[PDB]
Write a protein that binds this ligand. Structure first.
Ligand SMILES: NC[C@@H]1O[C@H](O[C@H]2[C@@H](O)[C@H](O[C@@H]3[C@@H](O)[C@H](N)C[C@H](N)[C@H]3O[C@H]3O[C@H](CO)[C@@H](O)[C@H](O)[C@H]3N)O[C@@H]2CO)[C@H](N)[C@@H](O)[C@@H]1O
Ligand SMILES: [Mg+2]
Ligand SMILES: [Mg+2]
Ligand SMILES: [Mg+2]
Ligand SMILES: [Mg+2]
Ligand SMILES: [Mg+2]
Ligand SMILES: [Mg+2]
Ligand SMILES: [Mg+2]
Ligand SMILES: [Mg+2]
Ligand SMILES: [Mg+2]
Ligand SMILES: [Mg+2]
Ligand SMILES: [Mg+2]
Ligand SMILES: [Mg+2]
Ligand SMILES: [Mg+2]
Ligand SMILES: [Mg+2]
Ligand SMILES: [Mg+2]
Ligand SMILES: [Mg+2]
Ligand SMILES: [Mg+2]
Ligand SMILES: [Mg+2]
Ligand SMILES: [Mg+2]
Ligand SMILES: [Mg+2]
Ligand SMILES: [Mg+2]
Ligand SMILES: [Mg+2]
Ligand SMILES: [Mg+2]
Ligand SMILES: [Mg+2]
Ligand SMILES: [Mg+2]
Ligand SMILES: [Mg+2]
Ligand SMILES: [Mg+2]
Ligand SMILES: [Mg+2]
Ligand SMILES: [Mg+2]
Ligand SMILES: [Mg+2]
Ligand SMILES: [Mg+2]
Ligand SMILES: [Mg+2]
Ligand SMILES: [Mg+2]
Ligand SMILES: [Mg+2]
Ligand SMILES: [Mg+2]
Ligand SMILES: [Mg+2]
Ligand SMILES: [Mg+2]
Ligand SMILES: [Mg+2]
Ligand SMILES: [Mg+2]
Lengths: 271, 46
RNA sequence: CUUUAAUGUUUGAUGUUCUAACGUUGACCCGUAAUCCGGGUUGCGGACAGUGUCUGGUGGGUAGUUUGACUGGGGCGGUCU
RNA sequence: AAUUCCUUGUCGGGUAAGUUCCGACCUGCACGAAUGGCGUAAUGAUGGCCAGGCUGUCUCCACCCGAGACUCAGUGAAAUU
RNA sequence: GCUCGCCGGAAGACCAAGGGUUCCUGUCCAACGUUAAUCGGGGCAGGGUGAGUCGACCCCUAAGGCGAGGCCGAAAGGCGUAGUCGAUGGGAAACAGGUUAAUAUUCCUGUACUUGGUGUUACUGCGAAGGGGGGACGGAGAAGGCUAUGUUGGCCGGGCGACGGUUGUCCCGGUUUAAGCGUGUAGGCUGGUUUUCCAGGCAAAUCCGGAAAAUCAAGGCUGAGGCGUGAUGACGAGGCACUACGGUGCUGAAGCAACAAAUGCCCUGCUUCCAGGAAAAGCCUCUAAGCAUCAGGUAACAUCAAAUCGUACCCCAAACCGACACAGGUGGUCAGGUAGAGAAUACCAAGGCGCUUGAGAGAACUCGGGUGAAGGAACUAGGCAAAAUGGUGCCGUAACUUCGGGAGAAGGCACGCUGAUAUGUAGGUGAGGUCCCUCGCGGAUGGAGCUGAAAUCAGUCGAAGAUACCAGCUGGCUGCAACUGUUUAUUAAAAACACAGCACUGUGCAAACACGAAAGUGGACGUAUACGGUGUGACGCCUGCCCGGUGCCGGAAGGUUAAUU
RNA sequence: AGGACCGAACCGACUAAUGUUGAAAAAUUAGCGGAUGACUUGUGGCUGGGGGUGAAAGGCCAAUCAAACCGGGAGAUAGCU
RNA sequence: CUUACCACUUUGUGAUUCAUGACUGGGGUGAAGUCGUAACAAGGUAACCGUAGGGGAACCUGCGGUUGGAUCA
């Protein structure tokens, strides 16, 4: 549930949490974690590459496995876990083979359910399957860029992709961004919508939230001096300039998108 | 108040020590520089 | 032979199809009880993308500078032959 | 009005008397809707105005206890010129 | 040497960093101490820091660094695989007395402990750079139990008192004692065991993971402290004998109980929460190749080994950082008594000190304060500064409001001491006795003794009883900004920045973008409910009309147009 | 529970006085703000100069900052004193 | 003498009530001023109710509903 927050104190009167009590309360499956080490958006030379980034909590990475091989062998969702690395809600599984793994955990992820993955598998949320098999117009789930690459689409929470159509070896699908993309079809993609979905409700409230969440504050352009940002200048706010990135680039126009090595797998751009 | 010099043998060395000195191109030059000028203590010996 | 049309032939304009350069931050094998690298296999893409030379555009992101004198202080205004 | 030049605009409130303050009028030199408009409980070592208590802040200073100030002995500077 | 005064969550004690002989003794006083100086952190000498167990090496790794080959780059070099380094973190073991002028978990006494090699004996599958487990990890809060330790009584030693009284209900003091060994308790966690089967843990595995049955359940880990042993020992007030007067030898009483406690321990626990909480080795186990009467493995005990550096002293300071023997800066540890909510505070203990110029005098004036008739903000840019207020409980408390607040609003009342209730109550604590028993650090029932608040009465002294220190001033109107926060180190803390929220816009992942000539890397081990950029800046009601100009998005048919040919 | 309340340590720095050849190249004293958090601190590490970093003041980058310090080009140039 | 109860009276802070106030909201009356003509006929776009937005103003427009609508629809 979302649940608001009593105006018990300032910077808490707005807070809008999001509790999914069905999430494991103990620690994670240790043998599937591995450090993390904050980066602070720094480069290999210590030079800050991406601004606003640092602090936050410890954050230990899980394992996930957006590949989903282990075919034919079924498994029952052991539990449901909370994941810091992603927005979605990771979920254990344990195959009948005796091996335990993680999964983003889609819509219907009731603890105890079963799931498979393979040319045969079964059209059902949880079961991974190569689009070459799954029906057309399905909600799908974690799509896979290249064949067997590992899946990198609709991974965030509440995300999903619609298999608009297929034409031979390629399958034209619709990304959540609203773009008409194409894929090798021979790419696993599982089924069902990614869990949570109600994630886009968190209000946070107090600044701290974002801060201890691993996000530093942001400095506006028309706030600093010229020598520091194209949006410099002072003596009374002012501006009389074109909205540009700290490097002189219309942050309201352009597009930057210059690949030409991918347009091929693109029909209708994000609108 | 707090001055501008907080000593730390460990750091003092690995910062301007003959070792970290003989670690860079222009480093071994810094030495040779003195070695030529006949410096007493090359670089914070002990 | 000229004014002009089918055949071959040549060469440009695009448009497809192909693989064999070229890419792959897909999947394996080996070097190797390695995540880099290299070779091999296969799949995908494919003369495209990319790069080099030349070239039109854009380009305070950056850089070198200019931005006059008279003037009953200077500026403003006016003046300079 | 943190925007009003004329400006102490005018009127009302507070005063014994108010170029500040509060409430109004609109003749807005030169407010105005995310270089946001108007509000807004709580918050503030924030700006302005008022009051009670308080008092040497003041009328108008007086006394008192100490550290220098002065005398002695030892050491013994400075700027400037 | 006797007084006096100051610090005492320190101005004490120990330690890291840093210093580097400043330590100690004996000497010397030129220069160095802001004075004198016989004195010193000064000069000159010697003397002085003794470890298997403390630490550093040393194993293990974090950040990050380095980096064979390798990939890049005019050169120099950049980057990075294997791997190797790198603590601020993980791995094994010593305590208590004594002693030196100065050393001390190092030397002496006593009582222990760890690990490795070699040997004797008993038993046995041993075997990794490998698999698994374990190490091994967050915030906050909520108890209970325990110790530290204090208080009081007992006990023992001493004391009968410069002035009224003080041999019995009296004053002073002490009342200590560790590692280790046994016990395994308050309490915490978890069901065990056998057999069978298997697409997992890169090979294998008896280990782990999974599936079956079968069978018992009182099993198995863990863990403060207590109690014994340590220890008829030590220490111990105190005497007796000696002194160079610093300090010596010998001898030695009691040495228990109750209650009260911790921020320490049980507690890497328990509850709960979202921001979801190092790594690796040691360690336990499993097998691999190998071995295959062997070697090894396990336990007992005997023995040898445990190297090498550090160890003086300062360490909130006159030994460090500040040019000074400078009112500044400096991380960790310990935490007594009275009163108190308490590491505030006040007075004190152990402990340490009086700050390296002093003697007088008692002028204006400056500095820091105490008190002021009457008035009470007339001061002044301005109530600047002062003065005031201050506690616990109870009564009671407005507009407004986001229903939390505003609110300790405001404004009041009671507070000392003595007796009774009650010879000390309510509570806390919990000894015999007694009961039984799985069974003993057992359970029950007993409620002695110990400790002990508040209240209500009546009385009583002062001007005053939150008497000191300490310890909100309050209210009303209004601009700005939601609020905590942040900022011009050294004139600006704000109306500035930032923020939660909002909107626009870019980005399909080898993302956009950014660092980089490149290789590579961050973004992100993220993937549009995501990441970047910009502007606004909670929340409420909203957010109009203009696309002519500039930019940006879409079109490109046509006109103009580069290299080239 | 809380970027919750009062208040030490601890972090900070709003006011005044004193100092201004200071005890001190920013402190002392009496008040003052935050004090479970965007908290505070030890130890070590990574960002290097037109570059870094910056809850943005042109602030910090060793008492130095509208381009650090050191050495060199270098006896830069100086219609000026 | 003293204590208790209590009158006058004192203080602080709310509640209610009437008066009043720079200005201002709309409402009532007023022979003959301006601007338009919304409604009553199909009132010349049928009218009205609720509601929302817009506008010098009656009003207009959108959504749903009613007939208390005219025609031989
Ligand atoms: N007072 C009545 C209310 O207000 C309005 O009515 C008011 C006005 O509209 C109306 O004013 C009218 C004006 O409309 C019309 N075009 C001209 C006429 N002379 C005016 O009349 C008004 O002013 C004049 C002065 O000369 C007076 O004499 C007359 O009494 C007065 N009614 O007179 C009323 C003032 O009394 C509403 N129409 C009415 O429905 C409502 O109930
Ligand atoms: Mg600014
Ligand atoms: Mg610029
Ligand atoms: Mg400026
Ligand atoms: Mg320029
Ligand atoms: Mg030049
Ligand atoms: Mg006004
Ligand atoms: Mg607008
Ligand atoms: Mg006044
Ligand atoms: Mg003299
Ligand atoms: Mg010496
Ligand atoms: Mg000495
Ligand atoms: Mg000496
Ligand atoms: Mg490297
Ligand atoms: Mg190592
Ligand atoms: Mg360490
Ligand atoms: Mg007597
Ligand atoms: Mg010592
Ligand atoms: Mg000593
Ligand atoms: Mg001194
Ligand atoms: Mg007076
Ligand atoms: Mg006045
Ligand atoms: Mg004041
Ligand atoms: Mg005062
Ligand atoms: Mg104003
Ligand atoms: Mg603010
Ligand atoms: Mg603040
Ligand atoms: Mg300043
Ligand atoms: Mg300031
Ligand atoms: Mg703004
Ligand atoms: Mg604003
Ligand atoms: Mg707080
Ligand atoms: Mg102070
Ligand atoms: Mg506080
Ligand atoms: Mg540091
Ligand atoms: Mg500086
Ligand atoms: Mg030259
Ligand atoms: Mg010169
Ligand atoms: Mg009409
Ligand atoms: Mg209608």
């Amino acid at each position: 549930a979302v649940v608001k927050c009593k105006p018990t104190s300032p910077g808490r009167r707005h807070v809008v949490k999001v509790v999914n009590p069905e999430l494991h309360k103990g620690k994670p499956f240790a043998p599937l974690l591995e450090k993390n080490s904050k980066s602070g958006g720094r480069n290999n030379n210590g030079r800050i590459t991406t601004r606003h980034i640092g602090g936050g909590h410890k954050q230990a990475y899980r394992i996930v496995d957006f590949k989903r091989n282990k075919d034919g062998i079924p498994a029952v969702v052991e539990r449901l876990e909370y994941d810091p690395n992603r927005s979605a809600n990771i979920a254990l599984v344990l195959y009948k083979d005796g091996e335990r793994r993680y999964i983003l955990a889609p819509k219907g992820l009731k603890a105890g359910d079963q799931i498979q993955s393979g040319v045969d598998a079964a059209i059902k949320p949880g079961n991974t399957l190569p689009m070459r098999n799954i029906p057309v117009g399905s909600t799908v789930h974690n799509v896979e860029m290249k064949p067997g690459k590992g899946g990198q689409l609709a991974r965030s929470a509440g995300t999903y992709v619609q298999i608009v159509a297929r034409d031979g070896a390629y399958v034209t699908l619709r990304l959540r961004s609203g773009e008409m993309r194409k894929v090798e079809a021979d790419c696993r993609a599982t089924l069902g919508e990614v869990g949570n979905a109600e994630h886009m409700l968190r209000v946070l409230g107090k600044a701290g939230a974002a801060r201890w969440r691993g996000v530093r504050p942001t400095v506006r352009g028309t706030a600093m001096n010229p020598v520091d940002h194209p949006h410099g200048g002072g003596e009374g706010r002012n501006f009389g300039k074109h909205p540009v990135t700290p490097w002189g680039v219309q942050t309201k126009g352009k597009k930057t998108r210059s690949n030409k090595r991918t347009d091929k797998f693109i029909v209708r751009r994000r609108s | 108040m707090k001055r501008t010099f907080q000593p730390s043998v460990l750091k003092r060395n690995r910062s301007h020590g003959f070792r970290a000195r003989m670690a860079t191109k222009n480093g071994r030059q810094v030495l040779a520089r003195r070695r030529a000028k006949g410096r007493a203590r090359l670089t914070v010996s002990k």
